[PDB]
């Protein structure tokens, strides 16, 4: 169901250098959306090229990669209603500068390349990445939905 839809997160090793880690859980904590999977890593390069992908045919590809993998990534899942499209909106938008305050980007940021936090941009996406970044024994198995939260 609808409330079972579930967003890939990574606060990237900037967000994590800076000490950003608890104050982003926090916000989607309040939001209500549930965590299902959370680990601190360094990713392999294997992994962030398929991470990235969708850029790969673009000269800014190598430093996405390489910044990815320069230091410890905070990689988080979580659920909820609409949580793809919503997690994004609480992120800002591509140029932190642009981005609202309220937003994290906007609340925390400057710099295209120093951008804290990506999430998934679609439900597909989501599920590509949930897979390439957790094993499923990783994940929590169902999450009984809170009343409070969902009617």
């Known amino acids: 169901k609808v409330n079972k ?3 890939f997160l990574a606060v990237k090793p900037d967000g994590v250098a800076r000490g950003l880690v608890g104050e982003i859980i926090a916000r989607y904590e309040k939001k209500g959306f549930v965590l299902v999977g959370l680990k601190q890593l360094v990713p392999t390069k294997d992994l962030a090229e398929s991470h990235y992908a969708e850029h790969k045919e673009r000269p800014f590809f190598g430093g996405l990669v390489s910044f990815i993998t320069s230091g410890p990534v905070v990689a988080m899942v979580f659920e ?7 997690a994004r909106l609480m992120i800002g938008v ?3 500068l642009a981005s609202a305050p309220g937003s994290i980007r906007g609340d925390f940021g400057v710099d295209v390349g120093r951008n804290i936090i990506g999430g998934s941009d679609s439900v597909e996406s989501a599920n590509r990445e949930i897979a390439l970044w957790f094993k499923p024994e990783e994940l929590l198995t169902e999450v009984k939905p809170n009343p409070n939260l969902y009617e």
């Open 5 to 7: 839809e579930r967003t």
């Open 80 to 86: 909820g209603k609409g949580v793809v499209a919503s």
């Open 94 to 96: 591509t140029n932190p």
